[PDB]
Amino acid sequence: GAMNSSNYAELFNNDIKLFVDDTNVYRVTVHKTFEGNVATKAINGCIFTLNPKTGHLFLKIIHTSVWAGQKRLSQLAKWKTAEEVSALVRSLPKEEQPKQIIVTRKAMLDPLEVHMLDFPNIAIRPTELRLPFSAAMSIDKLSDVVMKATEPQMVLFNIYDDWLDRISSYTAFSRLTLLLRALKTNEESAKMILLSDPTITIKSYHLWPSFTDEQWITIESQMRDLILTEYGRKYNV
Amino acid sequence: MNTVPFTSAPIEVTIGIDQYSFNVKENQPFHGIKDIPIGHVHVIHFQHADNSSMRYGYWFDCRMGNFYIQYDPKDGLYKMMEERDGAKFENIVHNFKERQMMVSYPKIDEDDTWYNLTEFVQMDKIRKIVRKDENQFSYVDSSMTTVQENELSDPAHSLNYTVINFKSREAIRPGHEMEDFLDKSYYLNTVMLQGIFKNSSNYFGELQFAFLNAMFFGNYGSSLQWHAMIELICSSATVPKHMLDKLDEILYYQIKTLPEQYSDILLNERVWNICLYSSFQKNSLHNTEKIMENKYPELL
Ligand SMILES: Nc1c(Cl)ncnc1N1CCCC1
Predict the structure, then answer these.
(1) Which atom of ligand 1 is nearest to the CA of B96?
(2) In a 3-state reduction of DSSP, which class is residue A140?
(3) Structural domain of residue B252, as residue ranges?
(4) What CATH number was assigned to the domain covering residues A164-237?
(5) Shortest CA distance to B94 belongs to which of B57, B72, B66?
(6) Angle at B54 between CA B212 and CA B258, to 5 degrees
(7) How far apart are CA B14 and CA B50, in angstroms?
(8) Signal peptide span per the entry (chain A)?
(9) B21 within ligand 1 shell (Cβ under 6 A)
(10) Contacting residues of A for B177, CB less than 8 Å apart
(11) Ligand 1 closest atom vs CA B7
């Protein structure tokens, strides 16, 4: 059944699982036509497929050519997502295939279930959590590789950098969701926080700055302030 | 016009014959039903006064033998029985019609309801859904489960309806996942019609039999089967024009006949709203949509 606050720790057990977020698969800019009508122009997207235990991110880049000549693109996007997730699973050795796939939006359930009929023992699950994975395109290196792609492409990342050398998965996932929740509520402030001290750098093979343990506590603190605030700035409290 | 005589009526019971029903008191002098129209299947069904639990009954075709109903005090039900002695059946029956101890199948001559509900229902197909081959007639009751229900326990007592499952490899061609799930025409026309049922008549016959078991026995798995077979047609973009026209007639008469007070459990809101208002065939069921809107507009 559904994944929620009550069974949260199952994410960090030793059963292979993947979150799949489709919120950035089909992306458009809306604009005016010379005739003064409105039209959309698609831009490159991505499927965000994440192992929450190991941090491995399978970033399938969805190139705008996928949409050429297609109708009902928002519906196709869910089926294209499920097709690419199914292809990824089939590509993995049996002992690496997930035992569960958790979709962040319930509209992915039937598309994924149908594409995974060949895998009756992989559980397809929704979640009651409001996870902030739409903000993954606020991570500069992820956004960059998506926008630069000229063809379909899979790029592999560890979204936890080297954190697991020092902290547990649970803690690493909590840091990740706080960072992304911040970036989603106010991207400018979020990003200001992360790059204020120029002495702290992002290694070439990482996504986030090389904070010391003590600097992470400060950073984490500042992100919670932002979220509380923006929640005030938004609701006036 | 044929006859299903009764040995007796030792327990108080509501007896149905097709869409008609009458109350028989305990030990009332009742010895059966006469003037049954030849050429159609029929169902004779029972609800005891003392236990409205378990409606049960028998599908039969008088052309296939001489049948009588005898109460069994051990198993506690009215049993259908086939008499092989045609003279002894005749001898027993002549006594009953002379003493006027039979009710008459009360067919109004203008009325085509039963024909329209059983148009495609054959006894030979019923007997493959209900497996009990030593008898020419078929028992059904409220509790019997379907093969598909048993998948998700006693198989001898099952309803072997054709398994329909929209999220199944049978339903979904590899590489046409989205196409086959959103437009079920290949599952309808190739898998089911051309492959399993062979023609639309057999498909409609199973659809009609499932509805009738749902209506007369409140058989839940039958109601599931009826709705699934409707939904498979409505969710297909490509349906032969003769099938859609006949489907509209079939469903019109089913909805017309349904008890006004049973629509709450026997009609699945989602299937009907999808079929009448969203599906490919939303525009192809004019008579059915009219009677649904004028009779069950709440459901919609
Ligand atoms: N043959 C019968 C007919 Cl036609 N109607 C009623 N009872 C019958 N049985 C004969 C054996 C015991 C009861």
Answers:
(1) 5
(2) helix
(3) 116-299
(4) 1.20.80.40
(5) B66
(6) 30
(7) 11
(8) none
(9) no
(10) 79, 82-83, 111, 114-115
(11) 6
